[PDB]
């Protein structure tokens, strides 16, 4: 992938671990400087704040909506359901807002599929989402100064929220 | 895929746009 892919993989992993911990155990089954590990946690914290202040993508509210709609997810189609949400979310392009919204979705979706009794469901959702960051969004992330840049972006949002 | 998946993705695109608009004031 792009420049510094190896470090970004590890940092994307840390951001996801921190993000899912802060918002949701069931979704699971080094090489970083203490700097990069700290920037990952800070980014997951700001993003959690942005999500909570954005009712359209709030984690709990979306799990409630997925259940009310009877979203037909099974062990057989759950990846293709996830991939369709991914395709539509970024079909117009990629920016930090759609990244935040997609990651919020991925936590709501992981909780939802785990509530549907899909064994390994949330773990698979976590791993798919981590690899969207690694493989499809990496060029955007690095272009916008990585997770350090996200914190600058998110602070600006929270000032405005 | 389900209608729900396409509609969820579409709404994530739009809410993401609203989130990003706040960066530019």
Numbering used by the authors:
A (entry chain A): 14 to 37, 53 to 57, 67 to 198
B (entry chain D): 64 to 88
Reproduce passages from the article.
A critical group of proteins that regulate apoptosis are the B-cell lymphoma-2 (Bcl-2) family and these proteins regulate intrinsic (mitochondrial-mediated) apoptosis. The sponge Geodia cydonium expresses a putative pro-survival Bcl-2 homolog, BHP2, that protects sponge tissue against apoptosis induced by heat-shock or tributylin (an organic tin derivative) exposure, as well as mammalian Hek-293 and NIH-3T3 cells against serum withdrawal or tributylin. To elucidate molecular mechanisms of apoptosis in these early lifeforms we have performed structural and binding studies on BHP2 and LB-Bak-2 from G. cydonium and L. baicalensis, respectively. We demonstrate that BHP2 shares the Bcl-2 fold with its higher organisms and, like them, bears a binding groove that binds the BH3-region of LB-Bak-2.
The structural basis for BH3 motif binding by BHP2, and its ability to discriminate against human pro-apoptotic Bcl-2 proteins over their sponge counterparts, was determined by solving the crystal structure of BHP2 bound to the LB-Bak-2 BH3 motif. Like other Bcl-2 orthologs BHP2 adopts a globular helical bundle fold comprising 8 α-helices, with helices 2–5 forming the canonical binding groove observed in all other pro-survival Bcl-2 family members. Clear and continuous electron density is observed for residues 18–38 and 67–198, with the intervening linker region being largely disordered except for a short helical turn formed by residues 53–57 that anchor the loop to the solvent exposed side of helix 6 from the main globular motif. Similar to pro-survival Bcl-2 proteins from higher organisms, BHP2 engages the LB-Bak-2 BH3 motif via the canonical Bcl-2 binding groove formed by α-helices 2–5. A total of 913 Å2 of solvent accessible surface is buried in the process. As expected, BHP2 Arg135BHP2 from the conserved BH1 motif forms an ionic interaction with the LB-Bak-2 Asp80Bak, an interaction conserved in almost all Bcl-2-BH3 motif interactions. Interestingly, Asp80Bak is also engaged in a second ionic interaction with His132BHP2, which in turn also contacts Asp83Bak, leading to the formation of a network of ionic interactions centering on LB-Bak-2 Asp80. A hallmark of pro-survival Bcl-2:pro-apoptotic BH3 motif interactions is the engagement of four highly conserved hydrophobic residues from the BH3 motif by the ligand binding groove of pro-survival Bcl-2.7 While BHP2 accommodates V71, L75 and V82, unexpectedly F78 is not captured by a hydrophobic pocket at the floor of the binding grove. Instead, the helical turn in LB-Bak-2 BH3 that features F78 is bulged out, allowing F78 to sit on top of BHP2 I94. This shift is enforced by the positioning of I94 in BHP2, where the protruding Ile side chain prevents access of LB-Bak-2 F78 into the typical position adopted in other pro-survival Bcl-2:BH3 motif complexes.
